Amino acid sequence: GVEHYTYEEYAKHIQELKDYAKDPNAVKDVSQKDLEETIKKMEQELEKIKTEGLKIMKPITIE
Amino acid sequence: GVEHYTYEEYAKHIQELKDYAKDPNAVKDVSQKDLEETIKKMEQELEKIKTEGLKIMKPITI
Numbered sequence: 001g002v003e004h005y006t007y008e009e010y011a012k013h014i015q016e017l018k019d020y021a022k023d024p025n026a027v028k029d030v031s032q033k034d035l036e037e038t039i040k041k042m043e044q045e046l047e048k049i050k051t052e053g054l055k056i057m058k059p060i061t062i063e
Numbered sequence: 064g065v066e067h068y069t070y071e072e073y074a075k076h077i078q079e080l081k082d083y084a085k086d087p088n089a090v091k092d093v094s095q096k097d098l099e100e101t102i103k104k105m106e107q108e109l110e111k112i113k114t115e116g117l118k119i120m121k122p123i124t125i
Contacts, residue, residue, distance in 0.1 A: 026065070027064025062082075
């Protein structure tokens, strides 16, 4: 199986990204509007995990 | 911070995962078959970086 997020894990990931976007010293390779748009898209995907069983591939770490 | 992978960076990340899968005595909560299936899905996403401009966000850090 492809490693994928749980609703709880993805909700936490989204909150970490929301908190980071508000850090005055946040480093981003996209505009503030693009990041807010991406967070909106992730919130729609989060609800699809609950309502459609959407499998959002989870990153794998090597350590 | 918020950064997206380049094709080269993601290709390197996939190779580092392939190298990891070769020492089964790994320290992760992923089975060998789930790791192989996950790497297959990542190879499809790698091609989308080149053919569709897919933006894959890197883990958020420092």
